[PDB]
Design a binder for these strands. Structure first.
Lengths: 63, 96, 78, 54, 17
RNA sequence: AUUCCUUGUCGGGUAAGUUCCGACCUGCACGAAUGGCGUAAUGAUGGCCACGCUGUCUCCACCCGAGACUCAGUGAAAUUGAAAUCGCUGUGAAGAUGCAGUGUACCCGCGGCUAGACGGAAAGACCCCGUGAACCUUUACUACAGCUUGGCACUGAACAUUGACCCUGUGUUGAUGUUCUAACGUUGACCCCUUAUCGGGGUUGCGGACAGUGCCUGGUGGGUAGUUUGACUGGGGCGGUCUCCUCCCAAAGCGUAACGGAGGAGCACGAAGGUGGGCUAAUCACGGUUCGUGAGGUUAGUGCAAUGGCAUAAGCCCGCUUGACUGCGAGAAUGACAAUUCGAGCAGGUGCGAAAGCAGGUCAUAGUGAUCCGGUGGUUCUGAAUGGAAGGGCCAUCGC
RNA sequence: AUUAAAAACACAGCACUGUGCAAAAUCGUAAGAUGACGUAUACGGUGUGACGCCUGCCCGGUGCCGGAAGGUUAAUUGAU
RNA sequence: UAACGGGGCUAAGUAGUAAACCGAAGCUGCGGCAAUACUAGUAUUGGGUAGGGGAGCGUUCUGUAAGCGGUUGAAGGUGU
RNA sequence: AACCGACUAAUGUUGAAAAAUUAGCGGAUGACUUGUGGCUAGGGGUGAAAGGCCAAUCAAACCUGGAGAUAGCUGGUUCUCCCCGAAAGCUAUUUAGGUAGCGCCUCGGACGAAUACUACUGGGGGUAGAGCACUGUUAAGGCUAGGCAACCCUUUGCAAACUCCGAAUACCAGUAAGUACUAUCCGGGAGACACACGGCGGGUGCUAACGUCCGUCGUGGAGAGGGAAACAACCCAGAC
RNA sequence: AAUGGGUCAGCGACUUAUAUUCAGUGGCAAGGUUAACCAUCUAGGGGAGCCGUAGGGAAACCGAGUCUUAACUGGGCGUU
RNA sequence: CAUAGCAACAGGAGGCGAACCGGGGGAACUGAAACAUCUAAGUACCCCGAGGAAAAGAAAUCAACCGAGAUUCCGAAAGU
């Protein structure tokens, strides 16, 4: 059949020219105790490390 | 995506964003593609006829990629400042 | 028939990260330490965790200085 | 086990920006509502902020 | 010490099924 | 038929009795219909004793038959990597026909025996493991049947009492009780279909808006069903442990295991944070109803473990404060990754300081929890005819 | 049935309990059945187990039975 | 026997000195093959499980093939 | 006695027999036994109750179908040559005999000395050793507060969690020669994540174990040849 | 002295479809390619579509830039 | 009275068949590396009813301010 996309992966990993882009973890709750520095630096989306990519690509066959 | 039962990467990382509906019926057009259009008027129908946009497209942005060598009147579509310049430089108009 | 022990923390990878003579860029962490085992000398800042880092480009120099004979990390202009 | 008793609070800008800092207090040591000058980023000014719940 | 083993099935040949 | 210690102790029986019988009572851990204690008779019932009896035995002997053995005919079987298939000592995946050394040994049957071939047989039933199975249990979880509760329907009428509401006593509804009959019930009687203890119809009696059933609903619910019931582990269980910090093990960079040796954390603090100014311990000696002087030199202190630090104190006191700032961030540290750490400098706005300056919490290293779902505020980015809105997003934050 | 014949099961007797007859109970979605062409001296369940002497204390728990005052509480209703 | 591998040894033991020799798939010699570099020759290289990579053999079937071989003997079988 | 049964023993156990025979044994007018025909059916029946029996089968019959259930387990996996060649680790895991990323292998591409070895130079050490200055611990004597003896003094030892000291090595960096297709980066493909012994440094254990857990190096694994009688893991040495 | 095989002969295990990706090879090339279907049917029609030709951003949207922020000395990703 | 009932007569039907079709009922293993939502799957299976096909079908449909014009089947949009 046609490969199905893992919609979990799709909703968390977006392909750009610069690689698979993702939202950092640990910015959902329990933030009072965290530093504004730490919270600030997590706010920008990031590109996945090389080791994380192969899987994601197998989960995102059309992306 | 299975990692031996450790919380996988596709779950330890948060979901983010949404899809606009407009995105699904929008299409960028390169300035070089405007060559393929037959006739002066570059509109949604003429783009569709040239197969430059699919028939479900509703909103088009022309972008500065390549060169325009003919005078075209772009009606109805959005153009980039750079593309506008290039259109106007090749004796085109940008209608509203 | 058991041990009250068992426990230990994760090793904190402390120590000299750039030794004497090493060329460092401004910002480069030189020493990671607990307290001032090494003090900050010229062109060296000290973080909240007493991390010594290069304020300027140059070469790391260790040096005993002062009446207490304390060790100092400096960046030498080179 | 958890021994933590300091209540979390939201300090809210005295400007109507609705910007809030969060923190915690010992409710015994500080019965009243906490007030403290803090930079509000929306109005880009240091203004009084006052305690509120959550 | 000697711990009495269970080396064989409780039903013995020729019936052992 | 219960007693662990235990062969309890005493008595009987025997030459000698862990059994038996009687009895004692410190009943580990009898006990009154899961009956207690008796009890004639009964039992292919359990225990023990005696007489008789004996090849049960001392300890076998002989004999009669059926096999075994031989001839003639028929003709299986499990098993089987291949075999030119010895002993011993040693070696060796650790119990050797097969290796080493050595000793012994002409080739081949037949009758016998079973020490070895870890002989044959059955992919160990023991034990463990598998995020296997089954069936069983229950105050494991989640359901369901059944049972049951109320609402509504099928389901109506009069009054009487009463509640609410309505107006000006009056209606409109709601209960509650009585009465009633016309729905409904009848597994009462009689008639007919009809030669029928079914059924239907008719008549009548007794009930009667009850019962009963449907839908909804609470309860009950091992009756039934689907399932879950962690891992490490010097087998497994039991116990202990599971994350984080400090030291040691750790072999003078980093890192480094054990159910190795030792301790701590799961916070605190609106000052115990920022900054300016100031200050400097412990403990003794000696004199005084804490005080003074000297010695001493941090042996003190550090909100809380340990370690590394700390006098320019990071320790101690005070004034003023909110930098326990918002956006960012050269450049590094450290991780499989998620994440974690340090950071000059820039912009904005700020506090302390005369000023250079210092300040993005705290001497530092523990004080913690991904994602999903959802909550609150903001933004007004999206939002399916359009305009809104809901709902998404983004930002802040809360809920393990 | 084919490694257990027994001290196990049953048993007469005993007791508790349910059951008023369209009985309880059971089989069945239901109709219909059994119960029973029986009717509390009957029928069902539970335990005990000829017979003799007897069968103590405890109703906190958990059942079951009864009581309803109050508290809590569903559908429903729909005030604000 | 069974604690030199045995025979056996008073050196065939132990320590030492001198000069020999034996001893491997090590090195060398001679012949050959291969991989990879270089410029056919050089140089290096060629133990190997899991595994990766490279190059082939043979089988059946289709085309080539109404061609080619075959009762003057095909396939198969069995020798050389 | 028949008949029904099945208490003991022996035989038999590739039987005469998938439960019997022989000698004995129990019931034998009863809750008896037997023939024929009926009925009850699988979470169902039936059970004087053994989880017994329901066609030599039963803690859920048998047949067919779903169905090639699923099987992180075991077995097995078929021609030839050439080149290279692991791992038995870390991290995580209802994970521990599985799996994932990383480490290690291979193939392609990029890149080219940035790499390895050595000399020299610059570093930080707190280990071995040693020492007793600290913290502990220890002996003798002195001196003496105190009530025999602190505290000090002299002498004398001990330390993984003591240090006034302090190597060799190792590591980091630089400079430089020579040797080497090294290092690095991006892709395709893996396998492995049970390790073993030996040396050295240790923990644990008895400085027991062919014990156990780490560090590091070697060999085995995946390695033939010679030696060590025989002997994976020792010695020598790498088989076109 | 762990497993399996008494022997022989025969048969007996990485497939097929579809999709994604990487590589080799060929065609064409800033283009490449058609699907169903039609068809006098391996031709030829058929341009729906897909991939490439632009990225950034959650998004609107902007666009060789964009996102972040009040704004970056900036910084992320991209440009070539 | 009538109706029920009863009889006569006429016309139908019944059973079988591999699949396809519409409808009534409807699992579980399995996957989720456990499992209950979920999956498997409205599948298997049982039943009923067809027909040469069946079903569906002629907008109280879409669309988006432009428009389209029943149903069915096939290619894309899109693993969006």
């Amino acid at each position: 059949p046609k490969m199905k996309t893992n919609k979990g992966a799709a909703k968390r990993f977006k392909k750009t020219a610069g690689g698979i882009k993702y939202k950092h973890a640990t910015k959902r709750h329990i933030l009072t105790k965290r530093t504004t520095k730490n919270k600030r630096q997590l706010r920008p989306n990031a590109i996945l490390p090389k080791c994380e990519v192969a899987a994601v690509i197998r989960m995102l066959p059309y992306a | 995506g299975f990692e031996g039962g450790q919380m996988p990467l596709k779950q330890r990382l948060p979901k983010f964003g949404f899809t606009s509906r407009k995105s699904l019926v929008s299409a960028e057009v390169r300035l070089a593609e405007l060559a393929k259009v037959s006739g002066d008027v570059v509109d949604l129908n003429s783009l569709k006829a040239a197969n430059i946009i699919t028939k479900n497209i509703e909103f088009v942005k022309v972008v500065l990629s390549g060169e325009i060598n003919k005078a075209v009147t772009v009606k109805g579509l959005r153009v980039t400042k750079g593309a506008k310049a290039a259109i106007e430089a090749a004796g085109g108009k940008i209608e509203e | 028939g058991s041990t009250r022990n068992g426990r230990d923390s994760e090793s904190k990878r402390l120590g000299v990260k750039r030794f004497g003579g090493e060329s460092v860029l401004a910002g480069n962490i030189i020493v990671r330490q607990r307290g001032t085992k090494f003090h900050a000398g010229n062109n060296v800042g000290i973080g909240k965790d007493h991390t010594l880092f290069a304020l300027t480009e140059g070469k790391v120099k260790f040096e005993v200085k002062g009446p207490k004979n304390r060790k100092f990390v400096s960046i030498e202009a080179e | 086990a958890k021994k933590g008793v300091r209540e979390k609070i939201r300090l809210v800008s005295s400007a109507g920006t609705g910007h809030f800092y969060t923190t915690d207090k010992n409710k015994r040591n500080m019965p009243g509502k906490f007030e403290i000058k803090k930079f509000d980023p929306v109005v880009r000014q240091h203004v009084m902020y006052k305690e509120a719940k959550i | 010490r000697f711990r009495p083993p269970i080396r064989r099935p409780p039903i013995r040949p020729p019936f052992y099924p």
